[PDB]
Amino acid sequence: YYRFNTGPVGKGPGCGFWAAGWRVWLFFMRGITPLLERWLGNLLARQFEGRHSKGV
RNA sequence: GGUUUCUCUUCAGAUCGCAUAAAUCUUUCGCCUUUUACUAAAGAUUUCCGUGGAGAGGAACAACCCAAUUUUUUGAGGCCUUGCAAGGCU
Numbered sequence: 001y002y003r004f005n006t007g008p009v010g011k012g013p014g015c016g017f018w019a020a021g022w023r024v025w026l027f028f029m030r031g032i033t034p035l036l037e038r039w040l041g042n043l044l045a046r047q048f049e050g051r052h053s054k055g056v
Numbered sequence: 057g058g059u060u061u062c063u064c065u066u067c068a069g070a071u072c073g074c075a076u077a078a079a080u081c082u083u084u085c086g087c088c089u090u091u092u093a094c095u096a097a098a099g100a101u102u103u104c105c106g107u108g109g110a111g112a113g114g115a116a117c118a119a120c121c122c123a124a125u126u127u128u129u130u131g132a133g134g135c136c137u138u139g140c141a142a143g144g145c146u
């Protein structure tokens with residue numbers, strides 16, 4: 001923002017340089033995909049196989 | 057003999073990747089009723105999004121000029137004495 005809004009360009013809602021913000025989430029998603037595949041596999045296993053009686 | 061393009065196997069040393077996530081455990085910290093979810097540094101171990109080398113199979117596109125000094129175009133041949141060799145010669 002401070003680099004975009006310089007000179008004649010004033011403060012206001014028009015900056016559209018979206019690569020940086022987009023990039024950060026993509027890296028978040030790289031980490032959270034394994035986690036959710038494991039967690040959601042447990043949710044589905046508990047839904048279809050049933051609750052498992054002996055436990056851990 | 058080539059190039060491009062898919063699948064599989066194997067080995068990864070290289071900033072394996074001029075980029076960068078998550079989880080588990082152990083130490084120390086911050087939160088302060090308990091547990092999720094957490095705060096932030098160190099170390100260890102995994103997962104995940106990508107990469108490189110090698111090999112095998114399939115498919116597609118192209119093709120079976122120096123003879124005149126310093127070297128290589130000659131100072132080249134002939135005589136005498138001693139035990140071919142040495143020397144004196146022309």
Ligand SMILES: O=P(O)(O)O[C@H]1[C@H](OP(=O)(O)O)[C@@H](OP(=O)(O)O)[C@H](OP(=O)(O)O)[C@@H](OP(=O)(O)O)[C@H]1OP(=O)(O)O
Binds near residue numbers: 011013
């Ligand atoms: O200049 P703008 O494009 O209008 O941006 C504004 C403004 O930015 P600046 O004043 O820094 O130029 C706000 O800043 P404050 O007025 O609060 O100081 C900022 O707030 P943040 O600095 O917290 O981002 C606000 O963001 P938001 O609308 O989320 O409050 C943001 O507007 P946008 O970022 O939404 O364009």
